[PDB]
Design a protein around this ligand. Structure first.
Ligand SMILES: CCCC[C@@]1(C2CCCC2)Cc2cc(OCCCc3nnn[nH]3)c(Cl)c(Cl)c2C1=O
Ligand SMILES: CCCC[C@@]1(C2CCCC2)Cc2cc(OCCCc3nnn[nH]3)c(Cl)c(Cl)c2C1=O
Lengths: 410, 410
C-alpha cells in the first residue's frame, strides 16, 4: 500500500486554495462602497473559517486512517470535490438569506462532505490494516468505530435538521448550523505536517495574489501604448507602477511573516488544538494584507483618508502577527511537551525567537501610534517600517546582541 | 542551521503558482479570436517552460547547498520575489519585441535571478557546513565552487549580452537568449520530493481554476434574480448549470490524472532528467484541460464546431496522459536504477501500473476516433469517457484481473 503523506499534501494544496478563494472578490472591489466592502470581508472570513473547520475534520479523519490505497485516494478526491463547493454555496446562502434553497444547498454540501468521510471510515475499518497502529491495537475497535461515526455524522445530521426546518422557521436552521462548528469545541495534536502544508499554501496564495492580478490586467496593450502614451512604453509602465509597489510591499510582508512562521514551527515539537485555533486566526488575518497594501497604494483625497488607510494597514499587520506571537506564548505555556529544548526559557535562541516573532507587532504598533501623535510624518513612517523590518531580519542576530549588551550596561 | 524541507516546499508552491499564472487569461478568453487565443496559448506554454527552467536551476542549487540558514532563507525569498516576475516581463517582451525596453526588462529579471543565486552559492561556500555532506567532503571545493558559479552565471552573462545587443540588432539578442536553454542540454537526478511538490501544486491549482472563476462571477445578484426570474433562484442556478458541469468534468479529469501520477511516483526511486522533461511536458499540457472543458460546455453553432471541440479536448487529454506514459516507459528502460522492484518487468503491480497509466490516453484516443468514424454519437461518447474512466479507476484492480482471466481462457 501507499505512504499517505503525499496524498494528504495534495488535499492541503487544494483546501488552502478553497480556503482563500473568497479573498479575490475583496481585492477586485473598487454606505454603498464601504458597506459592500465590509460585507465581502465578512463573507471571506466566514468562508475561511468554514473551510478551516472542514480541513480540521479531514486532518483528524486521516490521523485515524494511517495508510491508503487506490479506493481511499479516490474517495478522498471525491471528498475534496465536495468541500470545494463550500465557498460558493455559503456565498449563495448569505446573498439569499430568505429563500430556503440556498441554505438547503449549503446543508447538502456539508452532508455530502460528512457522508463521504463516513464512507471513508467504513472502508478503512473494513480493512483494519489501513488504520493507525494505535487504532489497530485498540480493543475498542467496534466502540471506536461507533464513536468516530458519531463524530463524523453529527455535522450532516445537524445540517439535515437545519434543512428540514428551513422550510418553516429558518432561524432554528441557522442555530443548528452554527451548532456544527460549536459542539466540537464544546463537546489534541494537529499533525505538524498538515498545519505546515495548509499554512504554506495560504501564505503562497496571499503573497502572489497581487502578481496574479497584475499579470491578468496590467500588461500594456500596443494600441493603448501608442495612443494614450504616444508610443512611450516606459510611460505606460510608470502609469501602473503603483500596483508594482503594492505587490512589492505585499510580498515583502507576507514572505517575512512566513519566515517568522517557519522559524517558529521549526522548533515546535508537538502542535495542539489551541495552536491550531490561533494559527487559523493568524492566517485568516494574513489574508487581509493585499487589501491593505492596495488601499495604501491608491490615492488619498484627504489627509484623513491616507491616515485611515495607514491605520488599517498597521492594524491588519498587527492582527496578523499578534496571533502568531500568541501561538508561541501558548506553546511556552506547555513548553515541556510543545517546544524544542533550544527555545525553552533561558534557551540559546529563546530571546532571538521572541524578537523574531514580536518584530512585526511592535513595528505596526509604533506606526499606528504615529497616526495618533505624528500625523505629519505618519505615512512616511509607514514606508520606513516597510524597509526597516526586513533589514532587522537580516541583522536580527546582531540587533538582538546589541539590545542584550545595552541591557547588560543598564 | 535548519531543515530545508519546508522552505523548499513553500518555494515549490510559489513556483507552481508562478508557472500556472499565465493560464488565467486563456480561460478568461471569450482570424481575430483564433489568432488571439493562439497567441495566448503560446504565451502560456513559453512562460510555463521558462519558469520550469528556473525551478530546475533552483532544484540543482538547493541540492548542492543541503542545509539552510535564516540569512539563506531570506536570500531564497528574494530569489522568489524576482522569479515571480518572469511571467509578466516575458508577456510584455512578447507583446513589445520592437522596443528594447521589454527585452531589457526580461533580461534584468533573469540576471537578477542569477545574481541572487550567485550570492547564495558564495554564502554557502563561505560557510562549508551548510553544504551537502558529500560536497563537504569534496577536495575540489575550489574548482567545484568555480563550476557552480559558472553554471549559475552562464545565463546572466548571455542575457546581459543580449540586452546590450538589443540596442543594435534584436535577432542576435533573441539568439543569445535562447542559447541560455540551449547550452545546458548541449554542453542527473532531480530530487524526487521537489518534483512531487511541483506537480502537486500544478494539479491542485489547475483542478480549481474553474471553481475560482465561479465563486467570483456566478453568484447571482438578488437585484438581478428578483427581476430576471421573479425571485426564482433555481432558474438562476439552472442558467449557469453548464459552468458547474464544466467544473465537475475538469476536476474529475485533473484529479484522476493526479491519481495516476501519484501511483506512478510512489514506485519511482529516482527521477532522471528525462523524467523531469517528460513531467514538465505533462504538466504544461495538463494546464489545458480547463480550456477544453470550458469549450465543451459552450454552445455549438454547427455540428462541425462541437466535433472540433471534442477533438481538441481529446487531444489535450491524450497529450497530458501520453507524456506520463512516456515517462513511465522511460523509467522501465532503467527500472534497475529508477523503479521499485514491485513494478519491474513481471512485477506484481507491473500490469496494474501500466493499466492505471494507459487507461486515460487510450480512452481519449478512442473518443477521438469516434469523431472520424461515429460522428453521430461522438459527443455522447465523449461524455461516456467522462463517466467510464472514473469507474475504470475504481474497478481497475478487479478489471485487470478480469483481463488476465481472459488471457487464461483464451
Ligand atoms: C535590500 C533589502 C530589500 C528587502 C526586500 C526583500 C523582500 C523579501 C526579503 C527582502 C523587501 C523590500 C521592501 C521594499 O520596500 C517597498 C516599499 C515601497 C516604497 N515605494 N517608495 N518607497 N517605498 C523594497 Cl523597495 C524592496 Cl526592493 C524590498 C526587497 O527586495
Ligand atoms: C460515482 C463516481 C464518480 C467519480 C467522480 C469523482 C471525481 C473525482 C473522483 C470521483 C468523477 C465524476 C464525473 C462525472 O461526470 C460528469 C458528467 C457530465 C455530464 N453528465 N451529463 N451531461 N454531462 C460525474 Cl456526473 C460525477 Cl458525479 C463524478 C464523481 O463524483
Amino acid at each position: 500500500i501507499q505512504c499517505s503523506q503525499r496524498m494528504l499534501s495534495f488535499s492541503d494544496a487544494l483546501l488552502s486554495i478553497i480556503a482563500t478563494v473568497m479573498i479575490l472578490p475583496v481585492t477586485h472591489t473598487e454606505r454603498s462602497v464601504q458597506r459592500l466592502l465590509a460585507t465581502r470581508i465578512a463573507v471571506y472570513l466566514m468562508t475561511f473559517l468554514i473551510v478551516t473547520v472542514a480541513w480540521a475534520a479531514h486532518t483528524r479523519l486521516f490521523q485515524v486512517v494511517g495508510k491508503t490505497d487506490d479506493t481511499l485516494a479516490l474517495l478522498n478526491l471525491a471528498c475534496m470535490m465536495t468541500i470545494t463547493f463550500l465557498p460558493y454555496t455559503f456565498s449563495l446562502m448569505v446573498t439569499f438569506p430568505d429563500v430556503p434553497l440556498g441554505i438547503f444547498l449549503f446543508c447538502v454540501c456539508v452532508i455530502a462532505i460528512g457522508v463521504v468521510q463516513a464512507l471513508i471510515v467504513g472502508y478503512a475499518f473494513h480493512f483494519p490494516h489501513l488504520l493507525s497502529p494505535q487504532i489497530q491495537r485498540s480493543a475498542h475497535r467496534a466502540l471506536y468505530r461507533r464513536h468516530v461515526l458519531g463524530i463524523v455524522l453529527q455535522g450532516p445530521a445537524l445540517c439535515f435538521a437545519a434543512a428540514i426546518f428551513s422550510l418553516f422557521f429558518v432561524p432554528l436552521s441557522y442555530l443548528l448550523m452554527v451548532t456544527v462548528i460549536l459542539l466540537p469545541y464544546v463537546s489534541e495534536p494537529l499533525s505538524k505536517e498538515r498545519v505546515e502544508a495548509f499554512s504554506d499554501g495560504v501564505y503562497a496564495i496571499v503573497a502572489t495574489l497581487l502578481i496574479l492580478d497584475i499579470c491578468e490586467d496590467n500588461v500594456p496593450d500596443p494600441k493603448d501604448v501608442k495612443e494614450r502614451f504616444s508610443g512611450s512604453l516606459v510611460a505606460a509602465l510608470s502609469a501602473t507602477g503603483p500596483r508594482f509597489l503594492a505587490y512589492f510591499g505585499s510580498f515583502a510582508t507576507v514572505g517575512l511573516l512566513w519566515f517568522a512562521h517557519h522559524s517558529l514551527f521549526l522548533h515546535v515539537r508537538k502542535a495542539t488544538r489551541a495552536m491550531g485555533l490561533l494559527n487559523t486566526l493568524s492566517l485568516a488575518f494574513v489574508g487581509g494584507l493585499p487589501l491593505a497594501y492596495q488601499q495604501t497604494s491608491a490615492f488619498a483625497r484627504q489627509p484623513r483618508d491616507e491616515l485611515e488607510r495607514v491605520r488599517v494597514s498597521c492594524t491588519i499587520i498587527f492582527l496578523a502577527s499578534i496571533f502568531q506571537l500568541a501561538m508561541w506564548t501558548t506553546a511556552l505555556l506547555h513548553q515541556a511537551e510543545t517546544l524544542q529544548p533550544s527555545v525553552w526559557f533561558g534557551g540559546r535562541e529563546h530571546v532571538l525567537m521572541f524578537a523574531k516573532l514580536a518584530l512585526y507587532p511592535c513595528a505596526s504598533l509604533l506606526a499606528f501610534a504615529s497616526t495618533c501623535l505624528l500625523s505629519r510624518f505618519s505615512v512616511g513612517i509607514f514606508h520606513l517600517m516597510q524597509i526597516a523590518v526586513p533589514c532587522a531580519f537580516l541583522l536580527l542576530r546582531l540587533l538582538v546582541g546589541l539590545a542584550l549588551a545595552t541591557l547588560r550596561v543598564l
